[PDB]
Design a protein around this ligand. Sequence first.
Ligand SMILES: Nc1ccn([C@@H]2O[C@H](COP(=O)(O)OP(=O)(O)OP(=O)(O)O)[C@@H](O)[C@H]2O)c(=O)n1
Ligand code: NA
Length: 461
Amino acid sequence: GEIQWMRPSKEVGYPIINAPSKTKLEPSAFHYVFEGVKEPAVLTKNDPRLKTDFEEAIFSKYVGNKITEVDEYMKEAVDHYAGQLMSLDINTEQMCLEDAMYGTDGLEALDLSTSAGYPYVAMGKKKRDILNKQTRDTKEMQKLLDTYGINLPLVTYVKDELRSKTKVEQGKSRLIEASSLNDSVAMRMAFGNLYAAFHKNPGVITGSAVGCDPDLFWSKIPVLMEEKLFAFDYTGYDASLSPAWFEALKMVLEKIGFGDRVDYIDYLNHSHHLYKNKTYCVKGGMPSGCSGTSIFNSMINNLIIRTLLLKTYKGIDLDHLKMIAYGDDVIASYPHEVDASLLAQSGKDYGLTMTPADKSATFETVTWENVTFLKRFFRADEKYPFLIHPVMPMKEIHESIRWTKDPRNTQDHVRSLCLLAWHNGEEEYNKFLAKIRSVPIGRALDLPEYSTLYDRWLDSF
Ligand SMILES: Nc1ccn([C@@H]2O[C@H](COP(=O)(O)OP(=O)(O)OP(=O)(O)O)[C@@H](O)[C@H]2O)c(=O)n1
Ligand code: NA
């Protein structure tokens, strides 16, 4: 990804974008009961915690575009992945505006709590108005599509979330490149059925984990994997993608019955952005807040891994590459060992910065004991080994519970953390429940006991 140009929105007829400069995150009733070293992310250049220019830091993720064309390896990767998807019968039909807006089997309704993007965010209009879950009325939307069209600029917001101290001081705040509601609806009509097919088939055929339920899916993963696991992390995956990877993605779409609307992918690739008073153009880079970001990111990861394997190991058998991706996160396997360090080297040539899995200092062997996916480990259940526990580290849970954005959602937030925590075991879980109940707010929460969660889990398969 690379910014081609940046300048004042007024110079080109665009209004300044108003963005709250104060974090909604504040210590919660449990702030001093649990240990945590993360704080709210810098949201403005004035934030006293800064130790470097903010503007420069939040845009440094666009490291450049390393490659220009789709080479032989990428093309072979495209053919093989497109081949797997083919065995799914993904309905190539366009999604009717009703299902696209309010959802259907395999696709959830639009999220009413997220920005509506330009121009609506400059007119004061909000999603609550345009959309109506009860009537499932397309009329208002339609009247807006015809009025403002598509390919509308992406409104860029700084993501309000917890970050390490270092990332606060280096202004490494993440950004939310929000797509207008129009674009989001169009894209969901265009790729609606593709999304659904993926959501309904997490696994090694789609090579996707999007829409999955860890409590059930974790038990299926080991069976799907080949003998030898391999993994690695990406640094700024989304922003590092070069235009060629988008072309490769279109090739895939074209081959499975969507050559029809690959133009949409171009907007993800060559995009127009609005940040505050400034406007800029980005060549490459997957925008964070578009319809299908997670899925197209996963599809591209499937192309990338196949590509690096073909480039590094001529003769490799892709039919035995078993991988599952969720955006940049991935858990992959092959019947034979592979050098992740080697793959990382080939990665640089494709514009990808790959490092040892889970911040390891060096590329070491990936095992079922040390492998993680979605921050979760894999741990066979003591009493029934064939059932696998997705285990989120308590540290992550401790960090999250120490803050709140709305006291009205404390019950839901803590309840959610409990559904993650109990997998760490009864002893740990009860210590967690105990600390929660050491202050008034916690004692008033309705939290599930261990046995209730474990028994429910056992019956869920
Ligand atoms: N609104 C956003 C913005 C970014 N991201 C994701 O967050 C990543 C960047 O987060 P950070 O953890 O700060 O990036 P990494 O470079 O992956 O961290 P590291 O340096 O430790 O490798 C991006 O690639 C993207 O996948 C996201 O999910 N939502
Ligand atoms: Na882009």
